[PDB]
Amino acid sequence: LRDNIQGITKPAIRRLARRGGVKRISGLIYEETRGVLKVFLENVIRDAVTYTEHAKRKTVTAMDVVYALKRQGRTLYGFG
Amino acid sequence: RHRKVLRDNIQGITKPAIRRLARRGGVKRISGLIYEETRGVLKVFLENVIRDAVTYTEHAKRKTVTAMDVVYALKRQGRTLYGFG
Amino acid sequence: PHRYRPGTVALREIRRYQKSTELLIRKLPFQRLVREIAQDFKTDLRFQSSAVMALQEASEAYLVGLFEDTNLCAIHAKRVTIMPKDIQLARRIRGE
Amino acid sequence: KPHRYRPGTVALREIRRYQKSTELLIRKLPFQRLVREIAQDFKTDLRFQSSAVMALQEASEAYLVGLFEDTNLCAIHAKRVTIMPKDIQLARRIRGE
Amino acid sequence: TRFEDSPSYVKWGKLRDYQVRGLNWLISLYENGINGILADEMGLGKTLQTISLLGYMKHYRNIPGPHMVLVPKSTLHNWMSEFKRWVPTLRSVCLIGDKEQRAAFVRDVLLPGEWDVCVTSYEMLIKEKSVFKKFNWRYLVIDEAHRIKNEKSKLSEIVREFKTTNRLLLTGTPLQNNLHELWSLLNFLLPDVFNSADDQKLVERLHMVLRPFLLRRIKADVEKSLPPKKEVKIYVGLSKMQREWYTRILMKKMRLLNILMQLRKCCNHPYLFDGAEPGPPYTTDMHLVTNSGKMVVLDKLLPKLKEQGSRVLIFSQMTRVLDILEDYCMWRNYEYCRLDGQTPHDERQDSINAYNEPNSTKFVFMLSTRAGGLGINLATADVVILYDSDWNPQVDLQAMDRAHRIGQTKTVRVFRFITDNTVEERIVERAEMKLRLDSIVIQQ
Amino acid sequence: RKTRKESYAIYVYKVLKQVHPDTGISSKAMSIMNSFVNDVFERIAGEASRLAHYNKRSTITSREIQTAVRLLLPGELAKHAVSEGTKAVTKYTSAK
Amino acid sequence: RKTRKESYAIYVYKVLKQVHPDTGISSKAMSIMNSFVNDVFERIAGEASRLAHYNKRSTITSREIQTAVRLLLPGELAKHAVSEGTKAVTKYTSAK
Amino acid sequence: TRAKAKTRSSRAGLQFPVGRVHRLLRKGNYAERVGAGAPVYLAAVLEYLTAEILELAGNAARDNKKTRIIPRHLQLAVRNDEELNKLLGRVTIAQGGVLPNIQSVLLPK
Amino acid sequence: TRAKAKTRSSRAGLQFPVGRVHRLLRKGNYAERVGAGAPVYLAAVLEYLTAEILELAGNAARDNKKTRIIPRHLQLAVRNDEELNKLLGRVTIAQGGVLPNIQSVLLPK
DNA sequence: CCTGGAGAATCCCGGTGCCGAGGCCGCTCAATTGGTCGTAGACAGCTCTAGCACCGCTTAAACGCACGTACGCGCTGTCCCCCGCGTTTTAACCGCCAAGGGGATTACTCCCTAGTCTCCAGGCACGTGTCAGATATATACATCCTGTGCA
DNA sequence: ACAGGATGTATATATCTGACACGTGCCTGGAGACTAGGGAGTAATCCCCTTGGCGGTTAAAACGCGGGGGACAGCGCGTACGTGCGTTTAAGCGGTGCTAGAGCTGTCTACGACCAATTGAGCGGCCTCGGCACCGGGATTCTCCAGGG
Ligand SMILES: Nc1ncnc2c1ncn2[C@@H]1O[C@H](COP(=O)(O)OP(=O)(O)OP(=O)(O)O)[C@@H](O)[C@H]1O
């Protein structure tokens, strides 16, 4: 797998910005958004993989993701 | 008859003190309206911390607020203080 | 031929997307991105579908909040358009 | 004729001086009176240890210094040099208070 | 065992038998190497004895070496005037001022060492401790010895860190609260002797051990002047508003931490409080007099003293009582004099002597209970009025005998107004306990 | 059958029928409510545990729960929750 | 005689002698180091407790401590700390 | 003999399981001992908070011309009340969305 | 007879109190059972963190030329280091001051 | 510079299918009841430390004031960059099927940990002396700022 | 663009002091040695759920183009803030006096843990039906020229 951060298309970043409430978006915003998304995802995925390794599983579970998010301070309601 | 209120204790913290705080922060020019806002912000922060500390002291059944109570309240608020317990 | 002014469609889309509640990123590209990021920490992982859905939900929420703070910064700087420097200021004041 | 420093050099030297120093900047007795007046609201006939007021003062100084740092960042973002109440409010809003 | 007449080196010296014998006693104490306490209350005078002692040490065997006198700032120019009057041979130097004045004075006078006697105050002593320690001291005189009555006090520690060959304590009331402070004074006198803290176990043993190195005479049985005092305690029941204020405070927003302190000055004037005062100062009128029982008592006593001497006294314990009484004095078109820490020192001190006049026709002189110093030649006073009593009977004794100078040849009167069913009764009970302890331990 | 999974779902449904008699809930909303209840339980219990440790005690009691509620809930919610808990303890003591 | 208090001061001073022979510490700095050790202990122990509860086990072990260290520390510290702890347990199991 | 088993929830008049809360407290490792009234207090608090949020959610769902509470209604209820927002300030609700707000500058002249 | 008592810290080559850590784990309400190697692991990790911070603080103190360590040196060591800054990001060190930094825009030119 | 049409966009409104919400049933495991015991904690008594209130003196800090100067804040002009829209391409989405990996469960065994007792040595409170840090004092240096010639 | 002066600041030296490092005595908790029991390791089995392929449909993304609005720089002004000075004030340090209240001991009791028997409350599984989603058609509303006001 390679070059999959580009799958986060410009229309999707525009839709997220529109939900945020922004009207005008500069051209350099998209690379910055891809970077910040990658950093956040990497933190959460590392913590989830640590939980999964402790459980000695090979499958990452919704509970693992929720526990990682709770550790980060970003509690998620709905999946467990 | 010579008796009147002295001052208000939020005015006890002063413009030069706030200027020194801003200098430590890294500020060069300060607007004139900054001081009332800083007094309000400080009042809010102290209100929250003192409320939590008074709750801890009430649970312990004491009438004296201790440094341990203040440290526990600050840890509750997410502002851990090292150097008092 | 009828043509809208630059900003009517943006406001209509703002209302539409702030009314809706669905995910705003493509599920398969997000899933491939998650698998790619997981490739580094451990080889040959498996994922439940709910795990990928939860990750996508959290990512959407984080980006939405960040964009809201960025919009506040841009309005503060007497602008309408958001910029990378706006995002960076938002992150720095958040605590990253 | 008397020597006069231009408007902004004494401020910079004060910045350096107070960033090198370590002691507390608010006055002890005014701060203690403020703490007692605030405690009056929640409970009457309260005593305070000496260490309690000092810990409170340390926390207040740290909080205000960090807030002014973020305020300066906002003011520079707006291409000003002066800080404003709107800068303070933006800092608080982004931090989440 | 010394000269029975006046020394040949003292000018205008009219010291009497008690003074010459005390000088001989101090001389003999120096000869035997024992440091003592001169416990003459007020009348015999101890400044004269100290000056004569130093003059003896100078004009006899050659020890004009460094000597130190510690006096409060209220008596500095008084001591300088006494030194220049009685024995002008000594070159006393007065050490007062801020950092730059202190530096100039020390560098230009103290370091060259042309001086003979250094007179300073306790505060300047603490300020210049380090520069003082270098000089080897031959004779250290501490006036008002009850200042160092408490061990682990900064003045006591500093004065012990000095290297003094001889020591001397001056105090008019050696005992104030208990035997521990007296032991502290004895420890400063001779640290190597009274290392341990400890009517047959007490009183008599202390009297016997104090006799070798303590001397105390009584103005009545020595001077034969100063006619005795008739003391009257007038019991005044507080009026209805005062009683209800007392109850509403005792049973109960406003801060009430120290119940004892807050209940106290309430009998004196219930309007010193903050937030409990009546409306804003619309005018100065009959609000102060009528609303306090002690105020109505003093106000009804005043016309008698006016139709009579009208130069009597005022004594109270609170600066706010002092201020409200000042306002009352101005409202009643009377004139007073003010002595307090807030008023500039050097200029108040000469103002006191200036106001000392054969005739004033001003009917009022107002003093605080502790503001009284060591001078104040109010021989014009006739009665001492105590608004309230303090915990220490010694403070009240100092306040009452401040107006009992010899300038006073007529019998002085002591008037006390006492509030029933209040804390004044206990305060009086403690005070009389302490006074009885002091009397049995010293006078008996 | 499969293993059992505890949930607060039936109690949440009963409370819902108490407040709005003619309304229903979806499975996702019930999952959210179950998570909310677990979160609040965790916060209150952890705060009470820390209180018991600080006071050098070994029992969790109604005083500890009340102090935790005062510390965690803001303002009006704290007032009303303390009132409700006191009422429930009174009823349990009387009807025991 | 005053009651006793348990502090990490002796061990902190030993480590200071080990890492800087001719250097000292002050009382306030020692209090800060004591608070720091207490705080890190609380964080690691709480993470281990929650891990054991998640996996439905009643015993905290070296696996739980290792995972808690990996979760709470940022990167290089985590790697070096894992090496340290593994070395310590190896030496402990070697003959004891 | 023995009386009919009366649940402690019915004894306290609660809709939440007092016995289950007691067991969760005992097996949660919060303290060595658990008092009798602590589960009752905790169940009452949980009931009050649940009733509050469900009342707000029901009103929101009614305003939308629906009779099933969905995460959108829960999110609107939580974010439109300041105390519940402060309680749930760090919490993300799945399929919730955001509150409609547009900053007044962006609105056309 | 009995063998001479060797401390578990000595057995594991540590300068931290393994037995005290074990007692704290058992009385801190973290689980029902505690392993043998868990206190050893935790003591070693605490030792590593303490050694790291003390080394950095001693270097800072030597830079300022003081042979004693003060909270100012502790704060200077904790900042100027990314890993320890992440660890103690939300911790206030009493009388430790602030890092010297002035924004370049304010600098005169 | 305000109206008035066009023209998209949105809302409203009726009808059709579907699938998840709500009810019902059987079963079993967790909560209730009853009885016993042993410890946590409530309560009273006593000690002595630390907090509260006040005064006196010194001096650093705060406060009020005057002057000028950068600095914030409108205004204007340029132009470039982003938005709105039509078109083409690409890949997501959806349904279906097949196959195996790995999560989940159960039974069995044994090894590790808790619980006790004994005793002894590490660690803590207390006391003490000396050295590192604070302070003062007079160089030496560095930095700012304005003024004068001649760039 | 430099000279010189006037601030301020870093450096080197001498004194003094109070806090730190060390020592000593004592005691309470940790180690050494044993027991027993249940929690976790291990193996084996089942089945479900994840991955992987495959084809068709269609929405969504990529691409290009034109134009208008907003960013950004420049300029001017007039005002509010920095700087320095002289006057006032109250903070900080030292003392005093007192007492509440925190902290430790002793004692007993009532409350929670524990165990056994019992039973009904809740959970999984199942069926069914009304609320919701979608759809198309018509009515209302917002936006943008263009034009005669
Ligand atoms: N020149 C003098 N002639 C006679 N008696 C004198 C003289 N000077 C002092 N005294 C005595 O001293 C008494 C009080 O004088 P003064 O006020 O100077 O004393 P003092 O120094 O305040 O005393 P102390 O501090 O020892 O109580 C007089 O009543 C008198 O007995």
Residue numbers in the entry:
A (entry chain F): 22 to 101
B (entry chain B): 17 to 101
C (entry chain E): 38 to 133
D (entry chain A): 37 to 133
E (entry chain W): 166 to 363, 377 to 430, 443 to 634
F (entry chain D), G (entry chain H): 27 to 122
H (entry chain C), I (entry chain G): 10 to 118
Would you copy out the relevant sentences from the publication that reported this structure?
Here, we use cryo-electron microscopy (cryo-EM) to visualize the continuous motion of nucleosomal DNA induced by human chromatin remodeler SNF2H, an ISWI family member.
In group A (ATP hydrolysis, 15% of A-D particles), DNA and SNF2H adopt a conformation overall similar to that in the structures of nucleosome-remodeler complexes with ADP-BeFx. The DNA at SHL2 is pulled out by 1–2 Å relative to the canonical nucleosome structure and the density for nucleotide bound to SNF2H is in a position similar to that of ADP-BeFx11, which is consistent with either ATP or ADP-Pi occupancy. However, we observe a gradual rotation of SNF2H lobe 2 towards SHL3, relative to the ADP-BeFx-bound structure, starting in the A1 structure and becoming more pronounced in the A2 and A3 structures. These features indicate that group A structures represent conformational states downstream of the ADP-BeFx-bound state. By overlaying A1 and B4 structures, we can visualize the extent of lobe 2 rotation toward SHL3 and the outward rotation of the brace helix. Several lobe 2 residues interact with the same nucleotide in group A and B structures, such as K455 with nucleotide at –22.
